[PDB]
Amino acid sequence: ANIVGGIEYSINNASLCSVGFSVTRGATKGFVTAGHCGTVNATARIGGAVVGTFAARVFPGNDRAWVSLTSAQTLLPRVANGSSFVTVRGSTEAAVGAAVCRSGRTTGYQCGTITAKNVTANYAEGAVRGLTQGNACMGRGDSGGSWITSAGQAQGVMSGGNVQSNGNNCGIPASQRSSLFERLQPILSQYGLSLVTG
């Protein structure tokens, strides 16, 4: 499969999440995603086909993981924006107030601004600390997916947010949204990963 931020993948033939970003670990191909999407060794599929397995994750506390892919997968420095793409150009972290977008299999490509840093989410499984908050909308299944600026700076991976009874927070105003992502930089260093860029 072609590995593009925001696309769907399944975990053990069960849950669906979204790809974060193509990465390498030495010779090993991978993608980063959210930790709550799978346990170590869980099987990832795209397009009906096995593409790899969860190599490592931290969740709760953090919310991060990477999927170690077979060599047959095609890593790409891209995030889905409708039928188009946003090129991944680096991992510079944006400040509060910056515009940012996110991509995922439920709500597609959505944009807003960064409103706060170092936010704690109290999820079912436990607290997750250190999250960045934006007011782009999202919904269930967008977890793991890319957060990126239009200028191509990869920010992090979708963790959670204040989804409403319809499964998303797109039906409330931006001022009322809390959409939380796990910062990319600590994921990259904890697992020794390099971001695929173009």
Are 49 and 81 in the same domain? no
DSSP-derived letter for residue 88 is -
| Residues known to be catalytic | 36, 63, 143
Parallel/antiparallel/unpaired status of strands 99-104 and 146-148: antiparallel
Question: Are residues 101 and 175 both part of a single domain?
Answer: yes
Query: Alpha helices, DSSP H only, in the chain?
Result: 184-191
Contact (Cβ atoms closer than 8 angstroms) between residue 23 and residue 64: no
Q: How was this structure determined?
A: X-ray
C-alpha–C-alpha distance, residues 147 and 120, integer Å: 18
Structural tokens at position 21: 């970003």
Exposure on the CB side of residue 115, measured as CA atoms within 13 A = 15
Same domain as 179, residue 83: yes
Q: Looking at the structure, do residues 83 and 155 belong to the same domain, yes or no?
A: yes
Give, as one character, the DSSP assignment of residue 163: -
Cα–Cα distance measured from residue 68 to residue 26, given in angstroms and rounded to the nearest whole number:
12
Q: Phi/psi of residue 10, each to 5°?
A: -110, 160
- Domain that includes residue 177, residue range: 77-183
b/e code 67-94 from CB counts within 10 Å (16+ = b): bbbeeebebbbbbbbeeebbebbebebb
d(CA 63, CA 79): 20
Closest to 55 measured CA to CA, from 44, 66, 70: 66
* Residue 26, phi-psi category: left (phi > 0), alpha (psi -120 to 50), beta (remainder): left
- The data reach a resolution, in angstroms, of 0.8
Are both 96 and 162 inside the same structural domain?
Answer: yes
108 shares a domain with 71: no
The verdict on 173 and 88 lying in the same domain is yes
**Euclidean distance between CA atoms 161 and 143, whole angstroms:** 10
Q: Could you tell me if 8 and 41 lie in one domain?
A: yes
Q: Which residues share a beta bridge with 66?
A: 32, 56
